[PDB]
Amino acid sequence: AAKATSRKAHLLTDRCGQEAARLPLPMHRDARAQQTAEVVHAHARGARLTAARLGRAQHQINGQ
């Protein structure tokens, strides 16, 4: 009766307990910034190749 009601209530409580990624991890600003600065160094080396070709052209033009 009332005992059975309390039993089913505790059963629902245990259900909620078992029910307990969508959350921000405790630490992660680190990883995010890491990936971002890696993309940064990537585009950096891209521009680097570009300007190194630029300066080879520059030394050629200085010879000209």
């Binding site: 309390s6 629902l12 969508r22 959350l23 991890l25 405790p26 992660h28």
Partner: protein, 90 residues
């Protein structure tokens, strides 16, 4: 006794669980001090909300539990004294 053991298991589980849930809200605040983090923290919100609903429920339930418990001990000792006095009459 059986209902009391039930209450015990339930309450202790609940304690450890919401302790770890506050621990999780704490991890939140820590990482905090981006918009996806905000969404995760709103998730924390709804979660701990259902959590406190559960807490209030458990409180009231074990309250009713101990109430019926007192009622039981009352009737029992009443009839026990009744038996003893019947024996006295004998």
């Amino acid at each position: 006794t059986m209902t009391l053991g039930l209450m015990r298991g339930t309450i202790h589980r609940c304690m450890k669980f919401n302790q770890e849930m506050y621990v999780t809200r704490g991890i939140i605040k820590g990482p905090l001090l981006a918009t996806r983090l905000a969404q995760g923290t709103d998730l924390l919100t709804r979660h701990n909300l259902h959590m406190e609903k559960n807490l209030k429920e458990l409180r009231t339930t074990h309250d009713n539990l101990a109430w019926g418990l007192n009622c039981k001990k009352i009737g029992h000792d009443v009839d026990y004294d009744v038996v003893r006095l019947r024996l006295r009459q004998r």
